[PDB]
Amino acid sequence: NIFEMLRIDEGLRLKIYKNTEGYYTIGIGHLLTKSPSLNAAKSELDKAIGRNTNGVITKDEAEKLFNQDVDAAVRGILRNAKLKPVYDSLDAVRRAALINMVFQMGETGVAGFTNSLRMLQQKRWDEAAVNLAKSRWYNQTPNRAKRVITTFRTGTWDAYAAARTVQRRLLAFALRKLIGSILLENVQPEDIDILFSKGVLMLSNLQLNCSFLNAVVSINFTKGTLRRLILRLNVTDIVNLNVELEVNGLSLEIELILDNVVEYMNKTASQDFEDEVINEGNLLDSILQKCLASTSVLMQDALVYIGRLEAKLDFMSFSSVKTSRLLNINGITVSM
Ligand SMILES: CCCCCCCC/C=C\CCCCCCCC(=O)OC[C@H](COP(=O)(O)OCCN)OC(=O)CCCCCCC/C=C\CCCCCCCC
């Protein structure tokens, strides 16, 4: 369906980001503001929820904002005079492509494509596709433009499936690099391939990379050992990403929030990922953000030392709830 398509095109991001046009945007392609002042952006989100945020949202809020943005899109199309005749005639797929464009560039601006809108009422797909290739929008999002145009041309979901495959490939690269970064163990592409072929990947007798932890948590970690690590991907629906990370037998030693993680990799891997992404034929930043945003975390039988005090944890979980994700912890006993 359409939400899948737009998820592919826009992706997901938890912090405030500059969209395809350069304007300030949040969530799954929700455009906050046309203004380029950062704090001037803070208005639409805060208004949407009703509480002071400093520019951050939750996943369900991004999904709600998604559904709502598509609803505003359909309001706009029916409101708009030149497009509604063009739209009323079309089938689900082409309708979806139109909705995508209107979603992307807004109600007001899209109605300027008179030549092509008319070209679409008459159902002249080919030369329409040639003409849309010669448009400011192709300049904005040439890849996306090519996909939407393809959708308009053939009338099926052929163009976006390839994008789905690409998403899988990139996500695999990102997960290999990330798990690689957390641990001292060598994670081959074959194991992540296992994580994608079968839903599960379990690594055992591992060891945390203390440099990673020191950089992310930021407070000195001495050593970290994890008995068992379980990763799971909603492979059946990779576009609506759901990640399941689980750590059993965590063993942290310490001597005396998420965004920085993204920063670290952004530094260290962006080049190599770029080297790979070009090889396959700042991109890694989006993938990682969607990944870490989609993940729900579990941990069992952890052991932490601080210094030295000892904290023993029976079970903990990190999931989304009704100003952020909730960290529920069970079975803490602290001793010497
Ligand atoms: C130790 C872990 C070892 C395993 C390492 C692999 C994990 C890393 C791989 C993926 C990580 C994915 C994490 C998902 C994001 C978590 C971010 C976070 O820390 O919470 C931030 C979140 C902000 O909202 P979000 O929308 O969830 O953030 C997303 C964008 N910032 O803020 C929170 O909810 C934090 C809640 C409090 C966290 C601090 C809790 C203190 C630590 C232990 C509890 C205290 C125990 C004390 C017992 C007594 C001891 C004497």
XYZ file of C-alpha atoms and ligand atoms in Angstrom:
387
model
C 0.000 0.000 0.000
C 0.841 3.718 0.104
C 2.181 3.991 3.679
C 4.770 1.380 2.727
C 5.815 3.464 -0.287
C 6.118 6.680 1.705
C 8.008 4.847 4.451
C 10.473 3.752 1.785
C 10.784 7.295 0.426
C 10.911 9.314 3.663
C 12.375 6.809 6.109
C 12.286 7.492 9.852
C 14.148 9.930 12.122
C 13.836 10.789 15.821
C 15.650 14.137 15.751
C 14.940 17.204 13.610
C 16.254 16.836 10.053
C 16.446 18.844 6.824
C 14.248 17.178 4.208
C 14.704 16.803 0.455
C 13.849 20.469 -0.114
C 16.031 21.701 2.752
C 13.160 22.649 5.074
C 12.886 21.468 8.691
C 11.140 18.107 8.973
C 10.338 15.453 11.615
C 9.099 11.859 11.866
C 8.205 10.068 8.655
C 8.527 13.071 6.365
C 6.353 15.392 8.434
C 7.338 18.912 7.458
C 7.565 21.093 10.549
C 8.600 24.380 8.981
C 9.654 26.253 5.870
C 11.679 28.611 8.061
C 15.350 27.738 8.487
C 15.542 28.880 12.116
C 15.843 25.811 14.362
C 13.737 27.044 17.274
C 11.200 28.445 14.834
C 10.635 24.796 13.928
C 9.851 23.785 17.504
C 6.333 25.189 17.142
C 4.439 22.666 14.962
C 5.490 19.539 16.902
C 4.784 21.072 20.325
C 1.422 22.210 18.964
C 0.712 18.721 17.621
C 1.279 16.981 20.954
C 0.600 19.784 23.438
C 3.761 19.586 25.551
C 7.287 21.049 25.438
C 9.639 18.655 23.624
C 12.843 20.462 22.593
C 12.300 18.907 19.154
C 11.924 15.154 19.732
C 9.073 12.671 19.202
C 8.246 9.009 19.875
C 7.684 6.307 17.238
C 3.921 6.030 17.705
C 3.745 9.819 17.456
C 5.650 9.600 14.158
C 3.220 6.916 12.934
C 0.238 8.988 14.064
C 1.810 12.004 12.342
C 2.250 9.782 9.295
C -1.407 8.701 9.132
C -2.412 12.295 9.862
C -0.146 13.715 7.159
C -1.649 11.371 4.592
C -5.087 12.438 5.853
C -4.147 16.095 5.363
C -2.899 15.113 1.915
C -6.241 13.570 0.940
C -8.024 16.650 2.359
C -5.815 18.842 0.188
C -6.269 16.883 -3.037
C -10.066 17.055 -2.783
C -9.795 20.734 -1.878
C -7.530 21.481 -4.841
C -9.300 22.215 -8.130
C -6.853 21.156 -10.874
C -5.814 17.813 -9.359
C -9.100 16.315 -8.107
C -10.354 15.680 -11.664
C -6.978 14.080 -12.418
C -7.253 11.981 -9.247
C -10.887 10.820 -9.389
C -10.119 8.900 -12.601
C -7.084 6.956 -11.326
C -6.655 3.481 -9.821
C -5.127 2.598 -6.427
C -1.498 2.566 -7.615
C -1.470 5.802 -9.639
C -3.649 7.432 -6.983
C -0.962 6.396 -4.508
C 1.765 8.008 -6.648
C -0.215 11.256 -6.826
C -0.781 11.156 -3.069
C 2.984 10.684 -2.743
C 3.761 13.820 -4.749
C 1.120 15.887 -2.923
C 2.493 14.563 0.371
C 6.004 15.485 -0.720
C 5.645 19.017 -2.079
C 2.371 20.182 -0.552
C -1.161 20.985 -1.686
C -0.438 24.452 -3.105
C 2.693 23.771 -5.167
C 1.803 20.488 -6.881
C -1.166 22.052 -8.717
C 1.369 23.870 -10.898
C 2.010 20.707 -12.898
C -0.830 21.541 -15.290
C 0.733 19.968 -18.397
C 1.310 16.676 -16.624
C -1.895 16.613 -14.583
C -3.777 17.061 -17.854
C -1.485 14.450 -19.404
C -2.635 12.100 -16.642
C -6.369 12.706 -16.980
C -6.021 11.648 -20.612
C -3.878 8.736 -19.400
C -0.900 9.516 -21.644
C 1.628 7.807 -19.370
C 4.790 7.669 -21.529
C 5.266 11.258 -22.733
C 4.028 12.313 -19.299
C 6.925 10.322 -17.860
C 9.261 12.062 -20.282
C 7.945 15.487 -19.265
C 8.034 14.824 -15.508
C 11.668 13.832 -16.023
C 12.083 17.474 -17.041
C 10.827 19.090 -13.833
C 12.182 20.773 -10.699
C 10.880 17.800 -8.709
C 13.204 15.404 -10.569
C 15.973 17.778 -9.504
C 14.792 17.589 -5.894
C 14.410 13.808 -5.599
C 15.629 12.157 -8.845
C 15.497 8.625 -7.402
C 12.094 9.147 -5.795
C 10.944 11.042 -8.874
C 11.961 8.062 -10.996
C 9.993 5.683 -8.753
C 6.815 7.800 -8.614
C 7.009 8.390 -12.368
C 7.462 4.642 -12.895
C 4.371 4.037 -10.756
C 2.425 6.520 -12.879
C 3.708 4.812 -16.024
C 3.123 1.111 -15.374
C 0.397 1.279 -12.726
C 1.852 -1.366 -10.418
C 4.090 -1.690 -7.355
C 7.103 -2.752 -9.413
C 9.328 0.264 -8.772
C 9.216 0.303 -4.965
C 9.953 -3.408 -4.431
C 13.489 -2.826 -5.730
C 13.815 0.008 -3.228
C 12.650 -2.478 -0.589
C 15.449 -4.859 -1.600
C 17.965 -2.009 -1.397
C 16.647 -1.112 2.069
C 17.264 -4.712 3.125
C 20.825 -4.636 1.769
C 21.742 -1.347 3.443
C 20.086 -2.353 6.719
C 22.149 -5.537 6.676
C 25.345 -3.525 6.203
C 24.355 -1.198 9.045
C 23.515 -4.024 11.443
C 26.796 -5.789 10.693
C 28.712 -2.573 11.382
C 26.729 -1.816 14.559
C 26.911 -5.274 16.133
C 30.541 -5.178 15.064
C 30.972 -1.936 16.998
C 29.264 -3.153 20.195
C 31.254 -6.396 20.386
C 34.860 -7.536 20.044
C 33.755 -10.558 17.983
C 34.020 -10.669 14.179
C 30.523 -10.578 12.656
C 30.652 -11.894 9.086
C 28.071 -10.869 6.459
C 26.907 -14.499 6.563
C 25.623 -14.267 10.144
C 23.611 -11.135 9.407
C 22.458 -12.992 6.301
C 21.227 -15.617 8.762
C 19.464 -12.819 10.658
C 17.656 -11.965 7.415
C 16.968 -15.436 5.956
C 15.705 -16.716 9.274
C 14.297 -14.077 11.617
C 16.775 -14.845 14.397
C 20.517 -14.509 15.050
C 22.063 -15.684 18.318
C 25.667 -15.044 19.274
C 27.067 -16.556 22.453
C 30.027 -16.031 24.782
C 30.578 -12.472 23.577
C 32.490 -9.445 24.832
C 31.471 -5.778 24.873
C 33.673 -3.138 23.289
C 34.408 -0.891 26.280
C 35.391 1.977 23.963
C 31.924 1.845 22.387
C 30.264 2.019 25.798
C 32.517 4.812 27.066
C 31.719 6.775 23.900
C 27.961 6.156 23.977
C 27.039 6.243 27.666
C 29.764 8.786 28.445
C 32.007 7.444 33.653
C 34.463 4.665 32.776
C 33.563 1.104 31.753
C 36.349 -1.389 32.490
C 35.031 -4.494 30.711
C 31.737 -5.865 29.398
C 30.918 -9.497 28.719
C 27.615 -10.767 27.357
C 26.808 -14.470 27.638
C 24.118 -14.422 24.966
C 22.827 -11.949 22.400
C 19.651 -12.434 20.427
C 18.684 -10.303 17.472
C 15.435 -10.533 15.549
C 14.138 -8.644 12.542
C 10.558 -8.257 11.360
C 11.723 -9.573 7.995
C 8.173 -10.176 6.774
C 7.672 -6.393 7.012
C 11.146 -4.834 6.782
C 9.803 -1.406 5.767
C 7.698 -1.048 8.911
C 10.799 -1.939 10.880
C 10.636 -3.753 14.207
C 13.950 -4.725 15.808
C 14.346 -7.078 18.771
C 17.597 -6.959 20.698
C 18.125 -9.108 23.774
C 21.103 -9.489 26.086
C 21.400 -12.310 28.615
C 24.201 -12.551 31.143
C 25.342 -8.967 30.721
C 28.415 -8.209 32.812
C 29.336 -4.540 33.026
C 32.278 -3.261 35.059
C 32.300 0.477 35.696
C 34.722 2.925 37.302
C 33.533 6.294 38.613
C 21.084 10.019 25.085
C 20.834 7.719 22.051
C 21.771 10.378 19.477
C 25.479 10.267 20.332
C 25.574 6.611 19.264
C 24.412 7.678 15.826
C 27.080 10.372 15.891
C 29.874 7.914 16.698
C 29.117 5.580 13.818
C 28.475 8.627 11.622
C 32.111 9.403 12.261
C 33.702 5.947 12.119
C 31.723 4.035 9.498
C 30.235 6.630 7.132
C 33.291 6.381 4.913
C 33.507 2.597 4.804
C 29.743 2.290 4.461
C 30.027 4.818 1.653
C 32.868 2.732 0.277
C 30.541 -0.270 0.405
C 27.358 1.452 -0.779
C 29.185 2.827 -3.803
C 30.857 -0.577 -4.291
C 27.494 -2.347 -4.368
C 26.313 0.289 -6.828
C 25.630 10.667 4.626
C 23.303 7.762 3.793
C 24.151 5.451 6.705
C 22.817 8.083 9.117
C 19.169 7.499 8.188
C 19.333 3.696 8.300
C 20.931 3.766 11.754
C 18.374 6.207 13.109
C 15.467 4.102 11.853
C 17.143 0.996 13.257
C 17.764 2.374 16.756
C 14.307 3.991 16.729
C 12.585 0.725 15.844
C 14.390 -1.458 18.371
C 12.750 -2.640 21.589
C 15.295 -3.921 24.087
C 15.332 -6.822 26.545
C 17.974 -7.799 29.087
C 18.053 -10.686 31.547
C 20.270 -11.577 34.488
C 22.605 -8.610 34.231
C 25.479 -7.869 36.606
C 26.924 -4.395 37.053
C 29.841 -3.196 39.143
C 30.557 0.455 39.886
C 33.632 2.032 41.469
C 33.197 -1.236 44.397
C 29.419 -1.738 44.508
C 27.518 -4.600 42.861
C 24.096 -4.365 41.225
C 22.317 -7.573 40.249
C 19.376 -7.300 37.854
C 16.917 -10.129 37.194
C 15.140 -8.665 34.157
C 14.719 -5.347 32.307
C 12.885 -4.073 29.207
C 12.921 -0.920 27.078
C 9.740 -0.312 25.086
C 7.395 2.451 23.872
C 4.547 3.630 26.119
C 2.022 6.349 26.996
C 7.368 11.425 27.361
C 9.576 8.681 25.902
C 10.327 4.960 25.955
C 9.848 3.280 29.321
C 12.655 1.386 31.033
C 11.032 -1.216 33.278
C 13.386 -2.984 35.690
C 12.725 -6.036 37.896
C 14.772 -7.848 40.525
C 17.483 -5.383 41.522
C 19.574 -6.409 44.507
C 22.649 -4.349 45.340
C 25.444 -5.639 47.582
C 29.197 -5.822 48.167
C 24.644 -2.134 28.739
C 24.041 -2.551 27.395
C 24.902 -3.651 26.766
C 24.365 -3.996 25.375
C 24.853 -2.962 24.357
C 23.973 -3.022 23.105
C 22.909 -1.924 23.178
C 23.188 -0.860 22.112
C 22.480 -1.244 20.811
C 21.155 -0.521 20.544
C 20.736 0.493 21.614
C 19.292 0.949 21.378
C 18.877 1.871 22.527
C 17.569 2.584 22.186
C 17.661 4.046 22.630
C 17.861 4.150 24.143
C 18.181 5.605 24.502
C 18.187 5.787 26.022
O 19.187 5.518 26.687
O 17.028 6.267 26.551
C 16.743 7.560 26.006
C 15.374 8.051 26.485
C 14.932 9.234 25.620
O 13.784 8.870 24.846
P 13.922 7.864 23.586
O 12.870 8.113 22.568
O 13.824 6.372 24.210
O 15.416 8.050 23.016
C 15.681 7.873 21.622
C 16.493 9.064 21.114
N 17.367 9.585 22.175
O 15.459 8.471 27.850
C 15.113 7.451 28.682
O 14.010 6.906 28.677
C 16.207 7.014 29.661
C 15.575 6.418 30.922
C 16.622 6.359 32.040
C 17.897 5.689 31.519
C 18.954 5.660 32.626
C 18.618 4.544 33.617
C 19.706 4.445 34.692
C 20.463 3.118 34.552
C 19.966 1.960 35.429
C 18.764 2.268 36.330
C 19.240 2.640 37.737
C 19.558 1.375 38.533
C 20.019 1.766 39.939
C 20.015 0.531 40.842
C 20.800 0.829 42.120
C 22.297 0.748 41.822
C 23.083 1.058 43.097
